[PDB]
Amino acid sequence: MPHAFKPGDLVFAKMKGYPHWPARIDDIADGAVKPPPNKYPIFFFGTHETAFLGPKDLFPYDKSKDKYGKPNKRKGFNEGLWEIQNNPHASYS
């Protein structure tokens, strides 16, 4: 059975006007800006951008990859597909 989301989990994260995007739940470093209540820090692979999203926009990677894990024209997307599959827990700092 599913648990709640935790740092390190891999997802496709959905934002308005973008395709479902390879991403991970990030840790919050000591001294770093915390997300709002009920939101998670989402690190988007490829673009290496962070947004704060809630679970309704988070699709677990294993379940969703057959649907969403396909090349896309958008900038950083295919780079992001490589990262989530090949080194999803690396520092992209």
C-alpha Rg (nearest Å): 12 Å
End-to-end separation in angstroms reads: 33 Å
Overall CATH class: Mainly Beta
Q: In what order do the strands lie side by side in the largest sheet?
A: 4-3-2-1-5
How many domains, in number, for the residues? 1
Work out the number of β strands: 5
Q: How much of the polypeptide forms β-strand, as a percent range?
A: 15-25%
Can you count the helices?
A: 2
Order of helices and strands: EEEEEHH
Largest sheet: 5 strands, antiparallel
Molecular shape: globular
CATH topology-level fold name: SH3 type barrels
CATH A-level architecture: Roll
Roughly how much helix do the residues carry, as a percent range?
A: 10-25%
SSE-based structural type: alpha+beta
PDB class: gene regulation
Keywords: methyllysine, pwwp, XChem, gene regulation
Assembly: monomeric
Entry title: PanDDA analysis group deposition -- Crystal structure of HRP-2 PWWP domain in complex with Z216450634
Give the secondary structure arrangement, pairings included.
Blueprint: E1 10-13, E2 21-25, E3 40-44, E4 50-53, E5 58-60, H1 61-68, H2 77-86
Antiparallel strand pairs: 1-2, 1-5, 2-3, 3-4
What does this protein structure show overall?
This protein is an alpha+beta fold and 93 residues long. The chain has a single domain, classed as Roll (SH3 type barrels). The chain is built from two helices and five strands, in the order βββββαα. The chain has a five-stranded antiparallel β-sheet with strand order 4-3-2-1-5. Strand 3 and strand 4 (50-53) form a beta hairpin. The longest helix has 10 residues, at 77-86.
